[PDB]
Amino acid sequence: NFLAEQYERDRKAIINCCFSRPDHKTGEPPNNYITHVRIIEDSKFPSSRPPPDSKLENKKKRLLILSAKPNNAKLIQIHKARENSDGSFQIGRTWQLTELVRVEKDLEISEGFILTMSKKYYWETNSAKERTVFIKSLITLYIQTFEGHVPELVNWDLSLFYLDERSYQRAVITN
Amino acid sequence: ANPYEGSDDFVAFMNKINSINANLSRYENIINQIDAQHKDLLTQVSEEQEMELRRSLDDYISQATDLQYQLKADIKDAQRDGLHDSNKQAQAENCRQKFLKLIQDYRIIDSNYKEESKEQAKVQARHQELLKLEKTMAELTQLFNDMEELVI
């Protein structure tokens, strides 16, 4: 199982670099790692579906990482990171989970999805399964974190998140 | 946590599934009645009838907690019996998904009632109600996680 073993190696490296030691300059406890996924980011088209003619040099390998504040399981953060040659990771951006307002499945690209937080971000997983697995983790985390609320969901099977039509209408943040 | 991985035997197993499906129906009705009593409280009810409505709500909440405990045990047991049979595992997992959706139904129903209580209010007994609601939602979250744990 390549995807399972890659997950085990990635998770151990992520926790080791970035979610186990006290803060470098502040001494705060580290965040608690929750999950992650590998993503492809197009540097020229980061907020929309990239065209097929997009140069291959535009494609960047990044990771999305979810974590919780050390003294508040209700404060979730999303981190984007890149992988260093030694096996460690460098976080380049952090969002608070309260920024997630819209999550859309790309109907045309089987690995594509769009998160609306600070703005719209287009990303691709490496496989359709990895999109299903990560978005499930993300929406499940949100519904649990914000006690019965859910961002706007576009083109998803609601049953993936244990919702149906009218449970989604009661829970969606747009009210 | 790696997300990337009755004498006849089948008649006996399906007796478990039939029993689970009956309690899932009981669970769904109890949640349905909890939602209804929330809507009753959200109408302006005389102080006498209001407390009879609160004790009935308390009774239904306790029934749900005990049904949840029984549904967890019975579903995880059906998952064990299916650890070596494709048909049994499909049956048990189907029951697990039904359970999780109802737990999600309950969690959303309590969330709507929590937010609608404040937007209708603005004594200290209202604070004890919020602590009871937060207790239940912590349990539903804890129960949600127990049901996602693998059975081995």
DSSP secondary structure of B32-84: HHHHHHHHHHHS---HHHHHHHHHHHHHHHHHHHHHHHHHHHHHHHHHHHTTT
The Cα A47–Cα A163 span in angstroms is: 28
Q: SS3 for A73?
A: strand
Whether B101 contacts chain A with CB within 8 A: yes
Chain CA centroid to CA A166, Å: 26
Number of Cβ within 10 Å of residue A14's Cβ equals: 23
**CB of A39 closer than 8 Å to CB of A62:** yes
Contact: A162, B103; criterion CB under 8 Å: yes
**CB of A98 closer than 8 Å to CB of A150:** no
**CB of A159 closer than 8 Å to CB of B121:** no
Kindly list the residues from chain B whose CB atom is less than 8 angstroms away from the CB atom of residue A8.
2
Number of Cβ within 10 Å of residue B49's Cβ equals: 10
**CB of B126 closer than 8 Å to CB of B109:** no
**Backbone φ and ψ of A41, nearest 5°:** -115, 130
Number of domains in chain A: 1
The Cα A90–Cα B2 span in angstroms is: 23
Pick the residue of B31, B35, B104, B111 with the most A CBs within 10 A to test the interface with A by mutation: B104
Q: Which residues of chain A form beta strands (DSSP E)?
A: 32-42, 59-69, 72-83, 89-96, 102-105, 112-116, 120-124, 152-154
Contact: A148, B103; criterion CB under 8 Å: no
The Cα A169–Cα A167 span in angstroms is: 5
Whether B1 contacts chain A with CB within 8 A: yes
The Cα A173–Cα A156 span in angstroms is: 16
Contact: A7, B97; criterion CB under 8 Å: no
Give the resolution in Å. Answer: 2.2
- Its domain, for residue A19, covers 1-175
Q: Which of B6, B3, B150 is nearest to B82 (CA)?
A: B150
Q: How far is B98 from chain A (nearest CA, A)?
A: 8
Long-range contacts from A76-80, C-beta under 8 angstroms, 24+ separation? A76/A34, A76/A141, A76/A142, A76/A145, A77/A31, A78/A117, A79/A18
Whether B141 contacts chain A with CB within 8 A: yes
Residue A41 tokens, joined: 């980011």
The Cα A153–Cα A142 span in angstroms is: 12
Length of chain B: 152
Nearest to A148 among B3, B97, B107 (CB): B107
- Annotation: CATH topology of B9-148: Methane Monooxygenase Hydroxylase; Chain G, domain 1 (1.20.58)
**CB of B17 closer than 8 Å to CB of B11:** no
Number of Cβ within 10 Å of residue A34's Cβ equals: 19
Residue B18 tokens, joined: 């039939």
How many CB pairs below 8 Å do chains A and B form together?
57
Q: What is the DSSP letter of A112?
A: E
Instruction: Tell me the CA distances in angstroms from B93 to A25, A94, B82, B83, B86, one per residue in order.
Output: 47, 36, 9, 11, 11
Contact residues, A window 117-156, toward B, CB-based 8 Å cutoff: 129-130, 133, 136-137, 143-144, 147-149
**CB of B31 closer than 8 Å to CB of B106:** yes
**CB of B120 closer than 8 Å to CB of B42:** yes
**CB of A42 closer than 8 Å to CB of A14:** no
